[PDB]
Amino acid sequence: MKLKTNIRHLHGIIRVPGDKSISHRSIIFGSLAEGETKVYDILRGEDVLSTMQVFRDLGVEIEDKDGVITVQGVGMAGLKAPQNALNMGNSGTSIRLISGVLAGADFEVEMFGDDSLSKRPMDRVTLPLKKMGVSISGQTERDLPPLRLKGTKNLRPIHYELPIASAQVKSALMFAALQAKGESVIIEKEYTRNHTEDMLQQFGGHLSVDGKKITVQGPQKLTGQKVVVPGDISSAAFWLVAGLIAPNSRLVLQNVGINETRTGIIDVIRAMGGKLEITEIDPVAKSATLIVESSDLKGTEICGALIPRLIDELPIIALLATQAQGVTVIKDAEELKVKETDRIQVVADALNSMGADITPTADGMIIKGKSALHGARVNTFGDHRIGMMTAIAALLVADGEVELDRAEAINTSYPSFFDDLESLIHG
Ligand SMILES: O=C(O)C1=C[C@@H](OP(=O)(O)O)[C@@H](O)[C@H](O[C@@](CF)(OP(=O)(O)O)C(=O)O)C1
Numbered sequence: 001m002k003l004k005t006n007i008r009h010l011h012g013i014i015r016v017p018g019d020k021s022i023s024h025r026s027i028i029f030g031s032l033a034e035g036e037t038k039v040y041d042i043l044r045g046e047d048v049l050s051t052m053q054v055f056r057d058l059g060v061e062i063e064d065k066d067g068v069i070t071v072q073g074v075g076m077a078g079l080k081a082p083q084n085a086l087n088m089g090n091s092g093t094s095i096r097l098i099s100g101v102l103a104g105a106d107f108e109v110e111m112f113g114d115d116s117l118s119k120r121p122m123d124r125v126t127l128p129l130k131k132m133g134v135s136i137s138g139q140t141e142r143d144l145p146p147l148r149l150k151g152t153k154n155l156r157p158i159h160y161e162l163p164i165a166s167a168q169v170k171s172a173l174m175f176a177a178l179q180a181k182g183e184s185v186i187i188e189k190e191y192t193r194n195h196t197e198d199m200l201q202q203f204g205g206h207l208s209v210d211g212k213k214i215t216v217q218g219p220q221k222l223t224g225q226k227v228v229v230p231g232d233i234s235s236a237a238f239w240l241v242a243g244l245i246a247p248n249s250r251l252v253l254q255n256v257g258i259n260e261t262r263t264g265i266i267d268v269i270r271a272m273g274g275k276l277e278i279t280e281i282d283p284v285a286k287s288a289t290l291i292v293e294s295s296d297l298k299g300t301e302i303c304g305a306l307i308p309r310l311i312d313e314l315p316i317i318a319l320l321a322t323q324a325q326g327v328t329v330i331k332d333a334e335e336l337k338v339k340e341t342d343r344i345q346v347v348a349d350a351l352n353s354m355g356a357d358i359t360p361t362a363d364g365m366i367i368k369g370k371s372a373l374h375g376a377r378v379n380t381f382g383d384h385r386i387g388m389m390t391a392i393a394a395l396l397v398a399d400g401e402v403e404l405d406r407a408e409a410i411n412t413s414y415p416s417f418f419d420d421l422e423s424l425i426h427g
Pocket of ligand 1: 024
């Protein structure tokens with residue numbers, strides 16, 4: 001589709017949709033717990049719907065009525081063999097976390113995904129899951145989907161040192177540990193989003209966190225909860241940058257989750273000199289309203305430790321970097337290559353075809369700032385973030401046109417994205 005170009009001003013209040021990571025987990029915890037769980041303001045992007053259907057296929061009743069998700073929990077050993085193979089679509093979070101969820105399933109199930117998902121490695125989760133007694137295998141040594149998994153009633157606790165900064169692997173193992181008999185210790189390589197840890201407690205579960213060492217005692221019984229989903233910072237991120245980058249702009253993003261393990265983009269905007277105001281802070285829900293203004297940026301360095309706090313924001317941060325004076329380096333981000341697309345190569349190609357000066361590297365990219373952007377055709381390749389990044393980049397194209405193919409990929413995490421864009425463009 002044709003993207004809006006040469007924007008003159010962006011003014012408005014935006015309430016971004018629910019956090020995808022938390023939305024996914026709300027369905028998992030709701031299904032594994034006893035009693036009912038209700039989720040409010042859940043993200044209805046396609047990936048979360050995939051998670052919901054997966055559990056329905058596993059025998060879980062999940063009702064979406066009057067904007068509220070109601071889940072009738074089945075226990076912790078209540079999932080049942082599905083009639084057909086489980087469709088994980090484009091959701092990496094779904095297949096990886098659910099692989100751990102099924103660690104105790106006394107049956108074999110198949111798990112497939114779309115073209116994109118089938119190119120992502122699952123070995124990072126099968127290796128440790130097989131240590132617990134789970135039987136799992138995929139295509140090639142990397143264990144690419146489709147996967148075949150058979151759990152066991154005799155799950156052994158896990159003792160694992162994660163070789164990569166992955167929140168998904170940590171979470172899968174935590175869900176598994178919850179079913180195993182004994183004490184499991186999962187050691188993070190670097191701190192990653194801790195939504196699983198937070199929600200396990202919210203659902204009556206227990207764990208001990210000593211720095212990067214996470215200890216989970218199993219097996220546990222969880223209790224249904226009322227879950228209220230906060231706005232997704234990863235979605236708010238597209239507007240945070242749009243507001244700093246577009247001329248004569250001031251955007252107010254309300255109800256944005258502000259969990260410290262997810263706020264990496266705030267630190268970067270800071271270091272780059274962007275005008276960012278944080279207000280209406282809810283110290284408990286961990287949310288706030290972020291206000292951004294047209295700013296003149298300076299390049300910065302993004303590396304180790306900060307990476308997991310903003311892996312998903314590197315695509316738009318690259319665009320952000322594109323508008324800053326000087327060079328900005330991104331490293332220790334080899335994990336990008338393994339996302340819905342190789343976010344190093346696709347991001348570099350996409351933006352270079354538009355304004356340029358992005359040098360892809362083995363562990364990130366180097367961007368030389370302040371490029372006037374121009375028209376181009378960009379393909380999403382099934383990655384919602386590539387699409388939304390191009391959409392904001394297009395706003396800065398003074399002359400020319402931008403065609404974005406496979407734009408529907410954006411509905412994977414932000415269906416009303418273009419609606420919100422339109423609302424800011426007027427007034
Ligand atoms: O646990 C989670 O919910 C996530 C943590 C990160 O993945 P990882 O554990 O591999 O670093 C994130 O990169 C991941 O975000 C992505 C990655 F492509 O989600 P998917 O893996 O589900 O596609 C995204 O939406 O960009 C969501």
